[PDB]
Design a protein around this ligand. Sequence first.
Ligand SMILES: Cc1cnc(Nc2ccc(OCCN3CCCC3)cc2)nc1Nc1cccc(S(=O)(=O)NC(C)(C)C)c1
Length: 127
Amino acid sequence: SMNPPPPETSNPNKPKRQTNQLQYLLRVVLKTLWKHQFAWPFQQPVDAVKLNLPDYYKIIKTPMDMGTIKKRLENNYYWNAQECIQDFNTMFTNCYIYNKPGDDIVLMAEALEKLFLQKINELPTEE
Ligand SMILES: Cc1cnc(Nc2ccc(OCCN3CCCC3)cc2)nc1Nc1cccc(S(=O)(=O)NC(C)(C)C)c1
C-alpha cells in the first residue's frame, strides 16, 4: 500500500497568533531536539513504502513527527502551545505503540522524550 497523506501543516481558514510559548517551542524545544543524535527517525513522516512497513499505518492511525511539528510552528498553525506539546506526545506514544520495550528505536525516543520534558519544564509563563 501507499503512504497516507501527511498531516496538515497549513490551513488558511485557521486564525493565527504568535505567543511567547509557541516561539519557545520552535526556537528552543524543537531546535534542541532536532540536533540530537537520535532525532533522525523522527524528522519526517514515516515512509512505510521506502522502509517496507506494511503494518505501520494499520497500527498508527494518528501519525506525527517533528518535521510536521516544525512546519506547523513555522506556519503559525498552532493557536495554543498545548496543541504542539500534544503533537510531541503523540509522536512519542506512537513510537512506543508500534515498537516494543527495549527496542533501539524506543530507547532513542526515550532519550528525546526526557530532553523534551526537561525543556518543557522551562516553558515560559504565557505573556
Ligand atoms: C518514528 C519511527 C518509529 N518506529 C520505527 N520502527 C521501525 C521501523 C522500521 C523497522 O524495520 C526493521 C527492518 N529495517 C530496519 C532497517 C533495515 C530494514 C523497524 C522498526 N521507525 C521509526 N522511524 C524510522 C525512520 C527512518 C528510518 C527508520 S529504519 O527503517 O532505519 N528503522 C530503524 C533501524 C531506525 C528502527 C525508522
